[PDB]
Structures are given as C-alpha cells and as structure tokens.
Design a binder for this molecule. Structure first.
Ligand SMILES: Nc1nc(O)c2c(Cc3ccc(C(=O)N[C@@H](CCC(=O)O)C(=O)O)cc3)c[nH]c2n1
Ligand SMILES: Nc1nc(O)c2c(Cc3ccc(C(=O)N[C@@H](CCC(=O)O)C(=O)O)cc3)c[nH]c2n1
Ligand SMILES: O=c1ccn([C@H]2C[C@H](O)[C@@H](COP(=O)(O)O)O2)c(=O)[nH]1
Ligand SMILES: O=c1ccn([C@H]2C[C@H](O)[C@@H](COP(=O)(O)O)O2)c(=O)[nH]1
Lengths: 285, 285
C-alpha cells in the first residue's frame, strides 16, 4: 500500500542522519529499507502527489529499446535525463569528446547488451552482449521455478563510461501460483523525485512481462540502499505527508502483445487516478 | 564512369548558357542530361575531389528516419542543411512562425508520410501518409517485375510549406536478373556541390535496398533537369577537371540488416577510397 512509502518518508525525516553527497545539497539518509506493493487489481501510482505517468511510460519504453541517448527520450516530451546528458554535465565528468545526450552504457544498454563493448549512443549493438530482458521472459515461460531470473544493470567494467551509474541496479522476478512478482535493489533512492518514478516503472515492467508470459501481477518489493531525502525536499515532502492517500489506480493493457519490443505507448491506460496537486521538487545534479 | 560527371562539367562550361536564379550568383545552365554509374563491385564516390562521405551517409539516415529537422542532422556534424533552415532564411520565405531548423515537408516527410498533413518538425506522423520507402522494398520482395516502384518527394500540395523544394524529386527502382538498378530524376542540380553528394547518396540507398531484398546492385542512372554551374564554382571546377580520375572505392556492409530503419552509420565502410585533395566551394543560399 501507499502508506509504506509515506512511512518511509516519515522515518527518514524523523530518524535520518545528515549526510553529504555527490551533488551540493545535503541529505537525510537511511541505509536499508524495504516495502511491498501489491500489483493485484491495482497499479502503484502515488496519489499524495501527481506522478508524471507519461514520463514513467516513455522512459520504460526507452529502456526496452536499449537506447542510451537522452535525445530520444527528450523528443517524447520527457526531459528527466536532459540534465545528466547536457554538455556541461558530460564535460564535468571528463567526457569532452562525447556527444550531448550520450549517457553511456546505462539501463538500456545493460538490459539488452550486457558485456558488449560500448562505443557511442549511435553504434549498432545488435547481436552483441547478453539480452537479459528477453532471457528473463524466456526463463519465465520455460521454468517458472528458476531462482536466477535476474536482470542486472550494474556493470563494474562499464562504470567509468556512465554519466550516472544505475540507481535501480538489479531486479529479480519470481513466479508462484501463476503470479509474477518482482523485487528491485535500488542502490540510491531520491525519495522525492526518483523513488515514485521507479516504483511505478518496475510495476509497469512487471505488468508487461506478466501480460506476455500469461501470468498475473503479484507483488513489487522495493528494496532501498541509500534512501535519502534532499534538504530542499524536506519542506515539500512535509506537505505531501499531510495529504490523505487515495486508492491506487488500475492499469489496463489495450491489446495482446507478443514481444516486449512490440509494446507502444498507446497500449496502456491508467484508470481512476485522482491524485493530490503536483508538488514541484528540484533535481540534484 | 566518373568521366561522365567530368564530361558534364566540361559540357556546361563549354556549351552552358548564362542564367539568373533564385540566389544571387548566376549560373551556367544546360537542360537535359543523363549518366549511368555502375554499382557492380564499385561505389560511385568521386575521386577527382574528396567527397564528404560522412555527410552523405548521415544525410541518408536522416532521410530514412523521416526527419525534417536540420538540427538533428547538424547534431551529427553535418551542416549542409543548416543554411536553408536558418531563422533569417525561413523569415525570407514568410515562415515567421516556424521554428528554426524546420525545413517543412521535405525529403524525410515525403518518403515516409506522403499525403499526411504536415504540422511541425517534431510532430508524430507515424501511421499517417504513404510510406513510399517501405512500399518500395515490399514491392521488390514480392514483385520485382513491377514498373511502378517509385519514391516521389515532389508534393505539389506541400510546396508552399517547404524551405527548399526537393531537388532529387523522384526515383524509380528496377529489378532484372537479380540486379537492382535505380534512376533519379533531379529537377535541379548544383553540379559542384549537391550533385556529387546526390550521386553517392542514391547509390548508397540502392546498396541498402539491395542488401535488404537480397539483390545485387546494378546501375544508377542519374537524370538531370536544370544542370547548372554557379559562377563562384567555375574556377574550383576548372581545377577538378584537370585531375586524373582514380578507380572507384567499394562499399561494404558489415552486418546482415533486416529492416532499412535498423541501418546505423557504423554498418557501412568505404574501402579503397583514394581521392584527390578537397576542393572548397561555397553554397548558394
Ligand atoms: N538527484 C537525482 N534524482 C532523481 O530522481 C534523478 C533521476 C530520475 C528522475 C525522476 C523524476 C524527475 C522529475 O523531474 N520529475 C518531475 C516530472 C516533471 C518533469 O520532468 O519536469 C517531478 O515529479 O517533479 C527527474 C529525474 C535521474 N537523475 C536523478 N538525479
Ligand atoms: N545551391 C544549393 N546547392 C546545394 O548543393 C544545396 C544543398 C545540398 C548540399 C550538398 C552539399 C553541401 C556542402 O556544403 N558540401 C561540402 C561538404 C563540406 C561542408 O559541410 O561544407 C562539399 O562537398 O564541398 C551543402 C548543401 C541544399 N541546398 C543547396 N543549395
Ligand atoms: O532512477 C533513478 C535515477 C536517479 N535517482 C537519484 C538517486 C540519487 O539521489 C541520484 C544519483 O546520485 P548518485 O547516488 O549516483 O551519487 O539520483 C533515483 O533515485 N532513481
Ligand atoms: O540534393 C540536392 C539539394 C540541393 N541541390 C541544389 C540545386 C540548386 O542549385 C539548389 C536548389 O535551389 P532551387 O533549384 O529551388 O532554386 O540546391 C542539389 O543539387 N542537390
């Protein structure tokens, strides 16, 4: 339920410790958290504040396509990766010869081409690397009892080439009683911005795979490493914490899709989403 | 084979007529020309001057992508369409409300969405209009004897909205004895600047389609309408006419590609290209 996220917010504000970070703003940090969100007949889209649903959907399709180019996501009206792909950010990391928008071997590259040699965002990687996403789907179809259905985005070899190392670094799938469940290990959680995106993102991915594999969505287990609240998010989150949460919406898939690459943005519809007003929170770059 | 291009240059300088034009610089003009460039075991990339092959390749991928945004091609390091997409140029055509880089319904829009109503360069046109490029490839696969395999970019209805109406306006494909040939009708030919680009551009496109349909490249027939030499190109072309042509290079495709949209710039490799020094020639805007 949504009260778990609000309970995590309240715990960090009350029991978190001051901690510096890569950005300039400090954080209130707590290490080690877990929450369980039901995917059964509902979709975990937060109601205590309006969540950018098109950003969640377009970013996930952008992941599935294997793209590491922020221009392709920004052309869909979703600018969440424009900052980490800007010219100044890439220059601050030493990527002086890299084209703007090239985030490096990140989520999209590691999901579909783990092990391939990364050249640039415009290179052809077809046939190179491990296709973790498809092997996950095939293992679910052929062996639901397998305890190794894992898609890992943390590539220690490719870390120096990434503009931002993967925050949701590893996820595992689990099948029992015709239910598909998903657990995600998030090494770093921006509780105000990224965490609501990531919870809705991997719930959507579980809905996609369950739709293809003929399973029913079960639980989404959100495991956090450094769950932190930025200082410039303390007052906005204190406002969100005073809002009464409303029932979760529902996710309807409008057509029968066979391959995860065939999913289009027009195939999904969120029903019954009545959130509180949107709360603007700045990104720490 | 290259001697045909040089013969046309020499023919325009010797028998061309003085003619004004839309730009400021005059021209030496000749109406009605034809040349045949063999694509068998060679690629017609001119040797009497170094041709910007990266510009030729990136522009075609930009055409296939259906883009009409000069900014998207310019971000690849190819500024050949930046002039006709500038703010001052669009204002001189009355396009005071157009965004910069929006060339209007041009090659990329007409190849993939012929008949759709053009909004702007960033609008989604997927599913709208006639996909001439794909219908060409499908017709070749299913009926090579068809005499209607044509991709036409000249749309009289969309002409007032174009920053520059298509110069290579119509192309036709032809299959016999498992050989794919292509003819281009170019209504207007900048013999010094655009024509060497256009010849290599449509030769590369024929290599792409033959690779997709499993055919061998045959001939490229270059038909010119208003073949003109700009005044500020007379001395540069007189220098090029003194250089001995060298054997054509070869074009190798590095992987088996199934759909023409999957082609990336890394999949192509020019081998044996030993051109004469580069000859700078200004563009007439
Ligand atoms: N410190 C930090 N925190 C993050 O959450 C991220 C992300 C992922 C992400 C997730 C959401 C947003 C975001 O700006 N969301 C907006 C939606 C509207 C918008 O895109 O402007 C919001 O809810 O206020 C931006 C980035 C990528 N990089 C991040 N760096
Ligand atoms: N008068 C006129 N002539 C043209 O050739 C065009 C074009 C297509 C085109 C083709 C090639 C170039 C061009 O600058 N080519 C250069 C490459 C190096 C460069 O970027 O200057 C060359 O081969 O010398 C520029 C524009 C678009 N608009 C044009 N208008
Ligand atoms: O999907 C994402 C992307 C980014 N972040 C946040 C977590 C951090 O606040 C910041 C990245 O900082 P590093 O931990 O890499 O220093 O981005 C997320 O929570 N989820
Ligand atoms: O692929 C191309 C694009 C442009 N041009 C040149 C021909 C003309 O010199 C100019 C277009 O001007 P108008 O013909 O519309 O005046 O561009 C070419 O030769 N090939």
């Amino acid at each position: 339920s949504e009260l778990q996220y609000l309970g995590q917010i309240q715990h960090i504000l009350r029991c978190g410790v001051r901690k510096d970070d890569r950005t300039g703003t400090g954080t209130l940090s707590v290490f080690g958290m877990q929450a369980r969100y039901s995917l059964r007949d509902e979709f975990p889209l937060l109601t205590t504040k309006r969540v950018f649903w098109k950003g969640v959907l377009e970013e996930l399709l952008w992941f599935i396509k294997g793209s590491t180019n922020a221009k392709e996501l920004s052309s869909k009206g979703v600018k969440i990766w424009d900052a980490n792909g800007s010219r100044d950010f890439l220059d601050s990391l030493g990527f002086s010869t890299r084209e703007e928008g090239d985030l490096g071997p990140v989520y999209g590259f590691q999901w579909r081409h783990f092990g391939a040699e990364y050249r640039d965002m415009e290179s052809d990687y077809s046939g190179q690397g491990v296709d973790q996403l498809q092997r996950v789907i095939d293992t679910i179809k052929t062996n639901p009892d397998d305890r190794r259905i894992i898609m890992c985005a943390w590539n220690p070899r490719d870390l120096p080439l990434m503009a931002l190392p993967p925050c949701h670094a590893l996820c595992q799938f689990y099948v029992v009683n015709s239910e598909l469940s998903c657990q995600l290990y998030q090494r770093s959680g921006d509780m105000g911005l990224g965490v609501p995106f990531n919870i809705a993102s991997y719930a959507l991915l579980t809905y996609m795979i369950a739709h293809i594999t003929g399973l029913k969505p079960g639980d989404f287990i959100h495991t956090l490493g450094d769950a932190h609240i930025y200082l410039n998010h303390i007052e906005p989150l204190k406002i969100q914490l005073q809002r009464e949460p409303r029932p979760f919406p529902k996710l309807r898939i409008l057509r029968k899709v066979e391959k995860i690459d065939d999913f289009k943005a027009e195939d999904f519809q969120i029903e019954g989403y009545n959130p509180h007003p949107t709360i603007k929170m700045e990104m720490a770059v």
